[PDB]
Amino acid sequence: LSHEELEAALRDIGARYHNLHPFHRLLHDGKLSKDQVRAWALNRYYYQAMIPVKDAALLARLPDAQLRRIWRQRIVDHDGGGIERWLKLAEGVGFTRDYVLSTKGILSATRFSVDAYVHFVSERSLLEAIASSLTEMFSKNYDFADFALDYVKRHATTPEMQRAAIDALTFKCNVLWTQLDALYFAYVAPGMVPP
Amino acid sequence: RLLSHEELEAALRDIGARRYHNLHPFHRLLHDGKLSKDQVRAWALNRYYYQAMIPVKDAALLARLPDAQLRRIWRQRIVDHDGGDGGIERWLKLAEGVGFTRDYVLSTKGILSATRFSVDAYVHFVSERSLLEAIASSLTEMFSMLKNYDFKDTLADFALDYVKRHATTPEMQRAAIDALTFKCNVLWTQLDALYFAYVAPGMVPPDAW
Fold first, then answer.
1. A-chain residues near B192 (CB < 8 A)
2. How far apart are alpha carbons B28 and B80 in whole angstroms?
3. CATH number of the domain bearing residue A11
């Protein structure tokens, strides 16, 4: 209920966050094939390629110029810049720039979980939309955010709002969690899926 | 790629020859009766969600329609599913009939995120794409049992017409062939999630009952 307990609860949900997912475990501890890392990169492009779609989706819902200016900074980071760093990693492990861009190869589950993220932000309430960035509280073995948290504290005024805040963060974690499930399903075990 | 028409029916049919959910490890396993009771439990729980959301889809779709004559045709699909007692209600029977409480199944607390998100994508697709695609995405219906699972009282042509007469540019024929692909993906990921979580191997935060 208070700002620090509210925060304590949001962090605890981190301690559900995607570094615990088995697809991260492997990756982080040097154990995935190169095709497996490529797949990862190919799919994770689409997640990155839509963060600015998401922040612009959210910007239009902001009620004053002051809040828009601030949020706009995140659009500026990715469109440039951020998306461009991501292309380079996937070019970095062998993909033509044009193949990554067109999304031909990405998995339907990624596409849905990411497009789920875009629509939450535009359908759910502003407090929830803002609360779902807060995974940003939580962010070399192959030869080959304080504004959001202030915001939710001052605007989650009631118990219900407060749980929406918490629910919204879990939604975020699920979005991310299920990208990874798909990628494990498709590419580490058992290993299936059409185009 | 040029124009088609009856060749177009055999392009649409042909997506179901491959991309339609009956050619899936989960659907093979269910059909042949090799899943445990719990695995028919997961499937049944998750599928409720797809079934509960088809009227939502068709409303969303009903709202984007340009006139009353069309809303009238399409309104039937809504009725089929909502009924006072109709299509969704059978599906709750199936869930009830493999041990679930009506209350848990209804709430969706325990569906997997991938189903939520695939089904939701279908809802948006129909709100966002052209009328021709929304309609085309119905066409798995051109492809619409369990005598290995001992567990009594628990035991379409308009669209295909619309698409041929309105798919007059090659760009529109692909869009509709994609629309049907898209939807094949929606069912396919539902099942990929189910396979991953309940058969080989996975688990998935709070979800599975």
1. 109, 182, 185-186, 192-193
2. 28
3. 1.20.910.10
